[PDB]
Amino acid sequence: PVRRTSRIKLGYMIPALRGDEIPAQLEAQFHVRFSNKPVAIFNVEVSSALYTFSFELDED
RNA sequence: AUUGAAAGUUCUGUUUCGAAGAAAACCCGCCUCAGAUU
């Protein structure tokens, strides 16, 4: 085996836990596809947060 | 350079079509700004 570690390090994107409130929400939205011969429904989760992330790179 | 090193759960879809808060009803019946002055 041969190995080579990545030169760029990235971490998870998590909203800031600042103060006593978490500024993030998550709701479910309902969507329909229209057809002329019914015999057509799906749901998707949407969010809105305040994200923060940090990274490292070694150009040397 | 660490049971570490390499990995997108991603692509495609209308909550649409139609339906007058409408008809009836007096705010109204009585009252002085009046007597004195070059």
Distance CA A39, CA A33 (A): 12
- Token reading at A4: 């080579």
CB neighbour burial string for A12-49, b if at least 16 within 10 angstroms, e if fewer: eeeeeeeeeeeeeeeeeeeeeeeeeeeeeeeeeeeeee
Distances (CA, A) of A30 to A38, A40, A45: 18, 11, 9
Residue pair A25/A48 in contact by the 8 Å Cβ criterion: yes
Max intra-chain CA distance, chain A: 63
Nucleotides on strand B lying under 7 Å from protein C-beta: 1, 5-7, 13-16
Q: Which nucleotide is nearest to A2 (CA to C1')?
A: B5
Give bridge partners of residue A15 from the DSSP assignment: A51
Given resolution (angstroms): 3.0
Distance, Å, A7 CA → B29 C1': 100
* CA triple A56-A12-A30, angle to 5 deg: 145
Distance CA A40, CA A34 (A): 7
